[PDB]
Amino acid sequence: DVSFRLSGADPSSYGMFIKDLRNALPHTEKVYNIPLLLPSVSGAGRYLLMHLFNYDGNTITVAVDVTNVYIMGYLALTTSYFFNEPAADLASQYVFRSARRKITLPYSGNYERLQIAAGKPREKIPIGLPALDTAISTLLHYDSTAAAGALLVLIQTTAEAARFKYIEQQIQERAYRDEVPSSATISLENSWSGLSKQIQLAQGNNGVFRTPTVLVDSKGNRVQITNVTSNVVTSNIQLLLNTKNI
């Protein structure tokens, strides 16, 4: 398992957590020196548990699919909560089985559906360590509309930060003040699958992407990524979604 405590948290301890999260994801191969997530894992080994504690020391445990870093569900006290999707229903066969009851959330875990449930795009939702503290607190007691917003914060401050060093850094910058994600952050989130695929396709193509990936950069400028020499590949991305899952 991995853990993170908001009480006394700072950019360093958050960085240690994101490092722990990355290191808990199994891989047998690196592609251009980036860990390649496994095609599949059978049984309970498929799910990583993240123990997150809010400032007051209350806790949820979040179940993460180690093949794609997707959040499947979470446990809050004696109630488990899972997304309304087959991958999460499958996960519910393995994690949080001792929960006294199981609630299936009234949406799947994908950004589009969460944003609709939340009533706002995540362009407009501040993220940061304070926002994560709020998210944990919200998820402690069931409220599906509020939970959608909390889950958008949670996904971005855990999974997306694990996937991209830039996003980790953005959260570290928001250690004591929330701020809506940069357009570059949004872009990277949306492009993780595409980037993962193209980095893998570059292996037998002299490091060249078969199809360019369009990103928005730090300055808000839309740019094309065409090969593995780009800083996004060398610097930024920390985990690759296996093409067998794309």
Ligand X SMILES: Nc1ccn([C@@H]2O[C@H](COP(=O)(O)OP(=O)(O)OP(=O)(O)O)[C@@H](O)[C@H]2O)c(=O)n1
The residue ranges that bind ligand X (CB under 6 A) are 70-72, 83, 85, 88, 109-112, 155, 159-160, 190, 192
By CB under 6 A, tell whether 230 contacts ligand NAG. Answer: yes
159 contact choice in ligand NAG, ligand X, none (CB below 5 to 8 Å, kind-dependent): ligand X
Residue 178, classed as helix, strand or coil, is coil
Contacts of 73-82 with C-beta under 8 Å, sequence gap 24+, read: 73/105, 74/139, 75/99, 76/139, 76/140, 76/141, 76/142, 77/140, 79/103, 79/142, 81/105, 81/139, 81/142, 81/147
Annotation says 160 is catalytic: yes
> CB 109 → ligand X: shortest distance, Å?
2
Residue closer to ligand X by CB (options 15, 121) is 121
State yes or no: 31 annotated in a binding site: no
SS3 string, 37-91, reads: CCCCCCHHHHEEEEEEECCCCCEEEEEEECCCCEEEEEEECCEEEECCCHHHHHH
155 contact choice in ligand X, ligand NAG, none (CB below 5 to 8 Å, kind-dependent): ligand X
Residue closer to ligand X by CB (options 155, 216) is 155
> CB 208 → ligand NAG: shortest distance, Å?
6
* Residue from 123, 160, 168, 189 carrying the catalytic annotation: 160
Residue closer to ligand X by CB (options 208, 246) is 246
State yes or no: 85 annotated in a binding site: yes
> Do strands 70-76 and 29-31 pair parallel, antiparallel, or not at all (unpaired)?
unpaired
Burial class from Cβ neighbours inside 10 Å (0-12, 13-18, 19+) for residue 78 reads: exposed
In whole angstroms, what is the distance from residue 80 CA to residue 73 CA?
Answer: 7
Residues at the interface with ligand NAG (CB under 6 A): 208, 226-227, 229-230
Known binding-site positions for N-acetyl-alpha-D-glucosamine: 71, 111, 163
Known binding-site positions: 69-71, 85, 109-112, 122, 160, 163
Known binding-site positions for guanine: 71, 109, 160, 163
Which residues are catalytically annotated?
A: 160
